[PDB]
Amino acid sequence: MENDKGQLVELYVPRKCSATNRIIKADDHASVQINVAKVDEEGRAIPGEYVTYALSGYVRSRGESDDSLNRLAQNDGLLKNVWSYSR
Amino acid sequence: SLPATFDLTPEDAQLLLAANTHLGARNVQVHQEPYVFNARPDGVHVINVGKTWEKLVLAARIIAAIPNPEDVVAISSRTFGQRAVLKFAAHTGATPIAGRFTPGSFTNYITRSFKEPRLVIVTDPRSDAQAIKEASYVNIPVIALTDLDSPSEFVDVAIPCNNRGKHSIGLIWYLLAREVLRLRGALVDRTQPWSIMPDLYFYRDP
Amino acid sequence: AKVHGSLARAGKVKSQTPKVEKTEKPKKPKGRAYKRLLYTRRFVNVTLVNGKRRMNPGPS
Amino acid sequence: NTEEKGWVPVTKLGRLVKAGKITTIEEIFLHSLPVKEFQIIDTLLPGLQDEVMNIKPVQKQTRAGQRTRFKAVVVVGDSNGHVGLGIKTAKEVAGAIRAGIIIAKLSVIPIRRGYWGTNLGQPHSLATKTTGKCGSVTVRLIPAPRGSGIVASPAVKKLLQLAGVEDVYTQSNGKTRTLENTLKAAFVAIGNTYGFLTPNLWAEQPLPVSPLDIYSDEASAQKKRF
Amino acid sequence: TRSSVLADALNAINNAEKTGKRQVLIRPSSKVIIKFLQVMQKHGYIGEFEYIDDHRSGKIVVQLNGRLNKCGVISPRFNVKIGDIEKWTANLLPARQFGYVILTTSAGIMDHEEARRKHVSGKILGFVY
Amino acid sequence: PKKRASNGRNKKGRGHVKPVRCVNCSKSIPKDKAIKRMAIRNIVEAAAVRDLSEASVYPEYALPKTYNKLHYCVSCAIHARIVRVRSREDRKNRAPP
Amino acid sequence: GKGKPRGLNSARKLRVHRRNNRWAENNYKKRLLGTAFKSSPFGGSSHAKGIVLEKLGIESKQPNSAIRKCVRVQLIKNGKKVTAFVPNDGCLNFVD
RNA sequence: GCGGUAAUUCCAGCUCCAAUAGCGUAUAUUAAAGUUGUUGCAGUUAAAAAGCUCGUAGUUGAACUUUGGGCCCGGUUGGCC
RNA sequence: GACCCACUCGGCACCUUACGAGAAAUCAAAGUCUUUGGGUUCUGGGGGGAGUAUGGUCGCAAGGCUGAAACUUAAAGGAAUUGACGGAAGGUUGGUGGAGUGAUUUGUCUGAUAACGCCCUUUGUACACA
Incomplete structure (x- = not known):
């Protein structure tokens, strides 16, 4: 997204989707950003730090965003079992 | 990531199973959601409670991440659910809405009931469809308390629970509220059963 | 349609109207001079009120 | 006063x-x-x-x-x-x-504006072939080389001059006389520029944290009596 | 009658891409399709596919990563000649700076940029971007 | 405008049925399209039932009913019989009441 | 596959169909049938010179109510009876 | 579409605009006409799917018949040398 | 033999979405088309003139099949929208927000709630000086 001599042009680098990698865009209001806080031993939330997930508008419209979110959070490592890869 | 503290205890399981949350829908499991366990006779499909607890912990963990507790908004049209949301607002932060949702809420100002929530929670997506659809036009994630028969449009971290009433939805709400008090609060680990009872939420007689 | 018609009025209006003459004036300077003149009246100052301008203003 | x-x-x-x-x-x-x-x-x-x-x-x-x-x-x-x-x-x-x-x-x-083919100082044309629709009117916007101008209908042309798209080819279909549809189509087309993966955008960034959460306590819907 | 199998494969890939999947089943595969998916895989429009074996046809389970906008067949495979490839790019590809009109040469099934440097051409096949 | 999906009442995967004659006007019309009604009225009405039951020989006995299938011609169905004209949304509704 | 044959070795059906289906538009019909030369008053030429016959008073259509003052003209070349309008204000008294 | 007595469309005159030693008018034609459409049209209701089936020519027609691995030789790109 | 439960192939159609498509009405296919190529037969190119004339060919006949032009006109239609009308059925207006590409509609409504602060409704319409 650059010119010839370094200098990065192309204003605003879009957000990729977490689920399908489709570009969520400026006008699109159906898209969502989920923020999950970082737990540890000694309990409690610990504000400041977030594991983020950008769900697209289409994914939410179609109505299988839930499944995608179950998948995404699992590989990060905050769900023992829950969602089977197999079916 | 996944500590040994935040696990499904037997007492909580015995509460859940007492409440009949594990009894799923009569008619059909919607194909969008796989949270099924043994198609038992007499037309009932049992839900994985280990998942239910976990999804609840996810939702709670999401809620705890939001900086101001006032901006979250619980929604309900079922009287039981209305009571529950009022209790959720009584204990934790998060201003509720009971009864008629009063459309045009999350959309543009001018109305009195103008709220711009970071996050929204719903009892039933079929009965509060207008709320779900309202949320989509201003970057509001939804966390519904779905059943097997219910939809899952515009929903995130949908929790599979029985949403008929009596003692069911209130139990789920109790679990959520308790969880989010345990996070960002002064409560101890699994040892403490907490002062407030599950009997407080449930239903509203007569 | 019909071929018959009142042809007696053929050139009614061209006749009865008053036949006055052209007024003599200063000579319009032609070619490049004309272009110069156009450029001057347009891109200097004088225009109508509002954003839009009338190049041929009526006296009023 | x-x-x-x-x-x-x-x-x-x-x-x-x-x-x-x-x-x-x-x-x-x-x-x-x-x-x-x-x-x-x-x-x-x-x-x-x-x-x-x-x-x-x-x-x-x-x-x-x-x-x-x-x-x-x-x-x-x-x-x-x-x-x-x-x-x-x-x-x-x-x-x-x-x-x-x-x-x-x-x-x-x-608008995601890019180059025709060669890479040089300052983008001038559109990044990709985009198209937008509204009723019968489908407007297409095709990237053009330097100093080529905005080859389009006067309305669409104006819309593009406003943006600062210097050089771009256009076409259209349907009954284009209606500006009600045509300009809407153009808007849809210039909008879909950012909704299109080029290879340079595959380099996955970390997802920026939402700024609403950074300044939620500082500047947000306060109570405040009078 | 399945007239072109490559066409069917590509149809399947596109529909699944539009519906927001990461994976597809396609039938009944070929050499041509495998070569095609290798060409695609080299530049990285798709992930690791897998040809299963059954004594008749062969199904491919393709894993796609959502870099693929649209790839499509060009039937009937016309005959292309040195500089016609450029004109083809102008017709169907979105920009000059990326995308691949894939085509079959006597050298082998190959993208257009490699054919320019190898200095060969032949029957056209689909495109990718 | 194609004003119905069904077009005529209940005929798909056939192409022809045997027509029936309308009871009121004697107009010919397909058997599917006849807007039919099961009339199930008594031999004696609620007005005539009491004295007639009192003065009859044998206790209770029977007092049967007349059964017949009334057919119609659409025109007759709207003019005389209950059916009405309805809205675009109420065209979609199927229940008898 | 969009109606028409996209076969590689089926040029015949494409060209033939097009030649059959060209017979619709005005210019193709006017050219190939030879309609300008056969039929019509002029012989496919721009200006045709003619004599006259008589002056007319053509009753014009609605809404444009007037009399038009045309001339019936017999031409030189074919010698067909034609009607022809006379332009400008007045100017029917020039011709006789 | 202007003209039925106040015509921003007619007749003149004032002023202005276009092109400018050159403009207007016809008929033919090219583009726009993705209104012929291979690239590139349409065919439920706007024109248009032939009553339906068979069937010769014509058009099109599954996959499958050697990839990989190396060993060197070795030209072309750009920068420290 | 029948029925119930779960799965299964082949259709008859249906109900809900709109992912998409469509100018719309609407469509699980009229979708997978300017990001315009799965194969392939048939038909159309403004409306009248005309499914007429002329020619052939088919048939006992009626007609069918194939099927023009000159001339004429600035429309013709399609969909939906507001009224207006019916010798059809029953008993006021912006602000902001949705529903729509708009016309506009919703609000300003069945007797609650996509809304928040002679008259009417639904349908038919080739009328729209009605």
């Missing part, structure tokens, strides 16, 4: 704009935060000028006699790389125009 300015920051963006926490519109574009108030994008970037486009009357037969109204298509823009198309209908002409401008200011969208 007895006057006062009165901005009145309703919604969560107003306070941010007034306090001066967010300087640019890039953040807004990233997180898709819906601009309700027109005064947000005005003082956020004063360089955002304007434009009109077209005015046509729209009539309405009734019991008594006949109602009449004036529709104004007001396209607004700025020569860096942001544009808005605002259609409005009202009984007065000035009222139609002002409201149209407001609507155009509300719904602004940026």
Whole structure:
């Protein structure tokens, strides 16, 4: 997204989707950003730090965003079992 | 990531199973959601409670991440659910809405009931469809308390629970509220059963 | 349609109207001079009120 | 005299704009935060000028006699790389125009402008072949080389000049005489530039943290008695 | 009657891409399709596919990563000649700076940029971007 | 405008049925399209039932009913019989009441 | 596959169909049938010179109510009876 | 579409605009006409799917018949050398 | 033999979405088409003139099949929308927000709630000086 001599042009680098990698865009209001806080031993939330997930508008419209979110959070490592890869 | 503290205890399981949350829908499991366990006779499909607890912990963990507790908004049209949301607002932060949702809420100002929530929670997506659809036009994630028969449009971290009433939805709400008090609060680990009872939420007689 | 018609009025209006003459004036300077003149009246100052301008203003 | 300015920051963006926490519109574009108030994008970037486009009357037969109204298509823009198309209908002409401008200011969208083929100083054309539709009118925008100009219909051409798209080819289908549809199609097309994966955009960034959460305690919907 | 199998494969890939999947089943595969998916895989429009074996046809389970906008067949495979490839790019590809009109040469099934440097051409096949 | 999906009442995957004669006007019309009604009225009405039951020989006995299938011609169905004309949304509704 | 044959070796059906289906538009029909030369008053030429017959008073259509003052003309070349309008204000008294 | 007695469209005159030693008018034709469409049209209701089936020519027609691994030789790109 | 439960192939159609498509009405296919190529037969190119004339060919006949031009006109239609009408059925207006590409509609409504602060409704319409 650059010119010839370094200098990065192309204003605003879009957000990729977490689920399908489709570009969520400026006008699109159906898209969502989920923020999950970082737990540890000694309990409690610990504000400041977030594991983020950008769900697209289409994914939410179609109505299988839930499944995608179950998948995404699992590989990060905050769900023992829950969602089977197999079916 | 996944500590040994935040696990499904037997007492909580015995509460859940007492409440009949594990009894799923009569008619059909919607194909969008796989949270099924043994198609038992007499037309009932049992839900994985280990998942239910976990999804609840996810939702709670999401809620705890939001900086101001006032901006979250619980929604309900079922009287039981209305009571529950009022209790959720009584204990934790998060201003509720009971009864008629009063459309045009999350959309543009001018109305009195103008709220711009970071996050929204719903009892039933079929009965509060207008709320779900309202949320989509201003970057509001939804966390519904779905059943097997219910939809899952515009929903995130949908929790599979029985949403008929009596003692069911209130139990789920109790679990959520308790969880989010345990996070960002002064409560101890699994040892403490907490002062407030599950009997407080449930239903509203007569 | 019909071929018959009142042809007696053929050139009614061209006749009865008053036949006055052209007024003599200063000579319009032609070619490049004309272009110069156009450029001057347009891109200097004088225009109508509002954003839009009338190049041929009526006296009023 | 007895006057006062009165901005009145309703919604969560107003306070941010007034306090001066967010300087640019890039953040807004990233997180898709819906601009309700027109005064947000005005003082956020004063360089955002304007434009009109077209005015046509729209009539309405009734019991008594006949109602009449004036529709104004007001396209607004700025020569860096942001544009808005605002259609409005009202009984007065000035009222139609002002409201149209407001609507155009509300719904602004940026344009991913790139090169024809070679890479050089300053982008001039569109990044990709984009197309937008509205009714019969499908408008297509094809990238052109340097100093080629905006080869299009006068309305679409104006829309593109507002954006600061120097060089670009266009086509169209359907009954293009209606500007109601054509300019909407053009808007859809220039909008879909950012919704298209080039290879340089596959390099996955970390997902920026939402700015709403950074300054939630500082500047947001406060209680406040008087 | 399945007239072109490559066409069917590509149809399947596109529909699944539009519906927002990460994976597809396609039938009944070929050499041509495998070569095609290798060409695609080299530049990285798709992930690791897998040809299963059954004594008749062969199904492919393709894993796609959502870099693929649209790829499509060009039937009937016309005959292309040195500089016609450029004209083809102008017709169907979105920009000059990326995308691949894939085509079959006597050298082998190959993208257009490699054919320019190898200095060969032949029957055209689909495109990718 | 194609004003119905069904077009005629209940005929798909056939192409022809045997027509029936309308009871009221004697108009010919397909058997599917006849807007039919099961009339199930008594031999004696609620007005005539009491004295007639009192003065009859044998206790209770029977007092049967007349059964017949009334057919119609659409025109007759709207003019005389209950059916009405309905809205675009109420065209979609199927229940008898 | 969109109606028409996209076969590689089926040029015949494409060209033939097009030649059959060209017979619709005005210019193709006017050219190939030879209609300008066969039929019509002029012989496919721009200006045709003619004599006259008589002056007319043509009753014009609605809404444009007037009398038009045309001339019936017999031409030189074919010698067909034609009607022809006379332009400008007045100017029917020039011709006889 | 203007003209039924106030014509911003006619007749003149004032002023203005276009092109400018050159403009207007015809008929033919090219583009726009993705209104011929291979690239590139349409065919439920706007013109248009032939009553339906068979069937010769014509058009099109599953997959499958050697990839990989190396060993060197070795030209072309750009920068420290 | 029948029925119930779960799965299964082949259709008859249906109900809900709109992912998409469509100018719309609407469509699980009229979708997978300017990001315009699965194969392939048939038909159309403004409306009248005309499914007429002329020619052939088919048939006992009626007609069918194939099927023009000159001339004439600035429309013709399609969909939906507001009224207006019916010798059809029953008993006021913007602000902001949605529903729509708009016309506009919703609000300003069945007797609650996509809204928030002679008259009417639904349908038919080739009328729209009605």
